[PDB]
């Protein structure tokens, strides 16, 4: 049930929200936009040094409140207590933004199984664990889940096999879960975010000299809109060529066709 | 780059082939077809009992050779040793059919993270391990990798989350790997197989009274035909609406866009 209107800041006012991989890039921006709305926000990543700043600056921007908890999403235990600790900190939760990933470079896959396992653990599994942990709270506030994926998670590219495997997984898993929430009349929206190339330090470090990326600041924003407006998918890619084709009716058809079937 | 000519059982004769999850269902059928064709075959799964039955039956259908090695794909050391032992049993390798999955059922997902983790380990991760271990031989023989997937690996159904996540994963990882072989000019084809409901013991059991399945023996042959013709994708379903609906050109186009 996507909402029948457009988005304005107030919708996030005093809304308790989690953001992962929020110490830099798209994550951080999302945190900043979030403050500019006066929402409550807890943020996480590994490094406490950078998290301290994000927290400190979100207050300036006017967040109702802002805190961090550091730990590696390599660690399902941490991911599970993180959500408990944060949500109890804020006495509830309205929107879960799953954004972090393990460190990846661009290269040929070359028998790097350990890196495929780690990608799958951090980028994909941890999202599930995180969701599991928040479901009870999200049911409470008829909240929302937002999952940051890529183009590389809808179609193929070389140089990101592990990465892509994991991004594809999110789609399969969370799109499947939606249909399940529907038929169980569970009212938690789930938004998958197909993002083209974005101007983050990390991304630009690997590209730039292979060329163009969309502005990180707006990306963060569109993500936030799609999530608040409870939309199934959000696309954000600089080239309007792309944004119009990615869609895929054969699937929407095939899914819906086999829905009223049972 | 797919061969541009019909296929003939003559294409698989003397071809040395591994088939995983071949004790029952689609995998068994595949082993049988390959035997009718005179290929060499090594099959695997956990149950030695059922495997013996298969092998023995394969030697009677005419396989150039036919061995088996039982093990769980839950164990990456076994996966890696399998391919070695098999390479030696056949002195090389022409095709690798990744077909096994972990047991599953149709159920709402609450918090079975260990099942999600096992699915990803067995239905996905082992394929990578297997692929990595077989790639050298396959290189030697300009061979093929055949990965068996589903509609649920291309579109979302309720009741199969873990399963889907893993099948989707195969698409992302193998389709991406396909691109890399092309820019590396590695001559080893990769075929992803998208199947609809098939009348295997397990499937029929599971969807007993909640949902027409295709014949598993014809399916088994399509898969092999797609592999030997080096097709990127095979689509097999009882509903021809479906088989034709699934192809995804808006995607093949997009991919070429940034290429
Ligand atoms: N930017 C792009 O070109 C692009 C394109 C498509 C999709 N996306 C998606 O957008 C999201 C963010 O991208 P980005 O470029 O903004 O990333 P980024 O700026 O490089 O930041 C990555 C974040 O994840 C954290 N992280 C790394 N390892 C972690 C771990 N083991 N446990 C917990 N956190 C960890 C990092 O903090 P620590 O190092 O301190 O842990 C950092 O905060 C990702 O989901 C990505 O897939 C990005
Ligand atoms: N049948 C369908 O409706 C359908 C639809 C779409 C896609 N597919 C795909 O087609 C393929 C085969 O399906 P199927 O229905 O033929 O399956 P199946 O008959 O149930 O056979 C599964 C095989 O995998 C083996 N296996 C199970 N757990 C294992 C483990 N831990 N380690 C190693 N092997 C294990 C089983 O033998 P052991 O228990 O002895 O190990 C068995 O040989 C799968 O990739 C499936 O996803 C099937
Ligand atoms: C983590 C990282 O920053 C990263 C990973 C994946 C994507 C990503 O989602 N892609 C955009 C959405 C498609 C990639 C862009 C570059 C593409 C590429 C790289 C090299 C060669 N050909 C294509 C791969 C997909 C962006 C950044 C990386 F890889 F370190 F740069
Ligand atoms: C292993 C198993 O036998 C199985 C799993 C998945 C699929 C599969 O790939 N599907 C076909 C390709 C789509 C399923 C068909 C039924 C679908 C479904 C289930 C419940 C309600 N509506 C549709 C779920 C995917 C087939 C068998 C199972 F799950 F035990 F039944």
UniProtKB/Swiss-Prot annotation, chain B:
Chain positions recorded as NADP(+) binding sites: 21-47, 72-73, 99-101, 163-167, 198-202
Q: What is the effect of changing residue 128 to E?
A: In a breast cancer sample; somatic mutation
Outcome of mutating residue 6 to K: No effect on activity
In terms of superkingdom, the source organism counts as: Eukaryota
Q: Which residues lie on this side of the membrane: Lumenal?
A: 5-259
- Cellular location of this protein? Endoplasmic reticulum membrane
- Changes after translation: Glycosylated.
Give me the glycosylation sites of this protein.
103, 142, 187
- Annotated control of activity: Hexose-6-phosphate dehydrogenase (H6PD) provides cosubstrate NADPH, and the glucose-6-phosphate transporter in the ER-membrane supplies the substrate for H6PDH, their activities stimulate the reduction of cortisone and abolish the oxidation of cortisol.
> Annotated Gene Ontology MF terms?
11-beta-hydroxysteroid dehydrogenase (NADP+) activity; 7-beta-hydroxysteroid dehydrogenase (NADP+) activity; cortisol dehydrogenase (NAD+) activity; NADP binding; protein homodimerization activity; steroid binding
Q: Which reaction does it catalyse?
A: an 11beta-hydroxysteroid + NADP(+) = an 11-oxosteroid + NADPH + H(+); cortisone + NADPH + H(+) = cortisol + NADP(+); corticosterone + NADP(+) = 11-dehydrocorticosterone + NADPH + H(+); a 7beta-hydroxysteroid + NADP(+) = a 7-oxosteroid + NADPH + H(+)
Pfam families tied to this protein: adh_short
Q: Name one GO biological process term.
A: steroid catabolic process
Task: Extract the PROSITE patterns matched here.
Answer: ADH_SHORT
Q: What does this protein do?
A: Controls the reversible conversion of biologically active glucocorticoids such as cortisone to cortisol, and 11-dehydrocorticosterone to corticosterone in the presence of NADP(H). Participates in the corticosteroid receptor-mediated anti-inflammatory response, as well as metabolic and homeostatic processes. Plays a role in the secretion of aqueous humor in the eye, maintaining a normotensive, intraocular environment. Bidirectional in vitro, predominantly functions as a reductase in vivo, thereby increasing the concentration of active glucocorticoids.
Which disease is noted in the annotation? Cortisone reductase deficiency 2: An autosomal dominant error of cortisone metabolism characterized by a failure to regenerate cortisol from cortisone, resulting in increased cortisol clearance, activation of the hypothalamic- pituitary axis and ACTH-mediated adrenal androgen excess. Clinical features include hyperandrogenism resulting in hirsutism, oligo- amenorrhea, and infertility in females and premature pseudopuberty in males.
Self-association and partners:
Homodimer.
UniProt protein name: 11-beta-hydroxysteroid dehydrogenase 1
Native species of this protein?
Homo sapiens
